[PDB]
Amino acid sequence: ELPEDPKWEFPRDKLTLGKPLGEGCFGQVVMAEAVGIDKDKPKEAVTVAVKMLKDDATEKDLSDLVSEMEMMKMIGKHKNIIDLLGACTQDGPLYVIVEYASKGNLREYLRARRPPGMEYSYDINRVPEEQMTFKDLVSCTYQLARGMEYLASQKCIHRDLAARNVLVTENNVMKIADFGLARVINNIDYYKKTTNGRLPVKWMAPEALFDRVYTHQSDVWSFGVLMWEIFTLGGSPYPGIPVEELFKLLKEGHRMDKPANCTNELYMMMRDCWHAVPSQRPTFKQLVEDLDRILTLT
Numbered sequence: 048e049l050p051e052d053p054k055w056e057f058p059r060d061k062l063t064l065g066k067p068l069g070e071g072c073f074g075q076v077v078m079a080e081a082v083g084i085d086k087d088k089p090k091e092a093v094t095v096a097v098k099m100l101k102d103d104a105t106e107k108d109l110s111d112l113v114s115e116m117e118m119m120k121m122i123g124k125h126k127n128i129i130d131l132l133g134a135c136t137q138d139g140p141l142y143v144i145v146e147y148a149s150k151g152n153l154r155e156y157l158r159a160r161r162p163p164g165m166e167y168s169y170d171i172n173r174v175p176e177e178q179m180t181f182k183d184l185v186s187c188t189y190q191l192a193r194g195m196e197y198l199a200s201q202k203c204i205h206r207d208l209a210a211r212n213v214l215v216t217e218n219n220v221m222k223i224a225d226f227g228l229a230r231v232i233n234n235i236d237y238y239k240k241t242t243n244g245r246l247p248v249k250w251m252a253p254e255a256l257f258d259r260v261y262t263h264q265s266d267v268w269s270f271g272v273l274m275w276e277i278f279t280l281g282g283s284p285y286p287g288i289p290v291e292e293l294f295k296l297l298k299e300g301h302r303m304d305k306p307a308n309c310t311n312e313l314y315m316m317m318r319d320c321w322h323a324v325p326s327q328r329p330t331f332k333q334l335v336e337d338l339d340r341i342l343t344l345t
């Protein structure tokens with residue numbers, strides 16, 4: 048049922064599955080070893096992650112996994128985007144092989160690096176994580192701005208940018224992931240007559256929610272929310288406000304208060320990202336240039 052792609056195909060006999068890696072954010076993912084996947088070291092057994100259907104998989108799960116694979120194929124390689132390494136598409140279950148990120152998603156990464164006593168704080172391995180500096184959070188912000196700048200230039204809309212959908216490698220490299228709702232658009236806005244509301248409310252631009260249209264400027268809105276998450280060390284956006292009441296509040300013009308780890312300059316960048324009129328928000332290219340300069344002064 049799956050056409051062969053010889054340039055991406057990876058032999059099953061070379062891939063050994065290990066332990067499950069969590070589930071919830073990126074579907075069913077497992078650790079694995081793949082001999083000769085890494086062309087740089089084509090004899091070495093490299094650690095990877097494999098996404099695969101569960102026993103309780105639906106028909107849509109299959110098509111979604113295929114679509115994420117092809118989306119990954121067409122997006123291309125970038126330092127701040129999770130890389131497609133290969134795939135197993137014939138004679139057996141569908142395996143999509145991706146870059147391994149040892150430190151998990153950004154949310155949990157930040158939450159483990161929160162001060163003892165704060166909500167959600169926890170010591171991984173029962174050992175305390177070295178504290179997030181200001182430079183670290185801005186570097187995290189910059190890397191993600193770079194990733195989205197690349198995505199935007201590949202004429203692609205993520206539509207679910209959050210810290211839960213960002214992966215973090217051993218060397219603390221940010222890697223945008225979860226292309227479940229990602230689409231390849233043109234210059235005009237993404238609109239469909241048949242509405243589905245599969246987008247998380249608290250990360251959605253108003254035009255996404257009210258007009259059911261999506262642009263690169265909507266992903267900017269979500270980046271503003273991602274900034275807020277970063278600088279609150281994985282805090283829940285619109286704290287104390289249920290999703291149900293946020294429909295009303297966005298129309299009234301509600302925005303989130305300034306994180307205390309954040310500078311005025313950066314919160315302004317946040318507030319610009321949260322402009323009601325999409326073309327009044329900065330572009331990712333602009334966001335990169337600013338974050339460059341700020342990071343340089345640290």
Ligand SMILES: */C=C/C(=O)N1CC[C@H](n2nc(C#Cc3cc(OC)cc(OC)c3)c3c(N)ncnc32)C1
Binds near residue numbers: 071073076145147
């Ligand atoms: C809610 C948390 C989780 O479910 N996990 C925490 C971190 C664990 N984990 N997931 C992945 C992954 C992935 C992945 C991303 C992606 O983006 C486009 C596509 C695919 O397949 C299409 C898979 C990882 C990785 N990659 N490394 C380490 N831990 C991971 C699970």
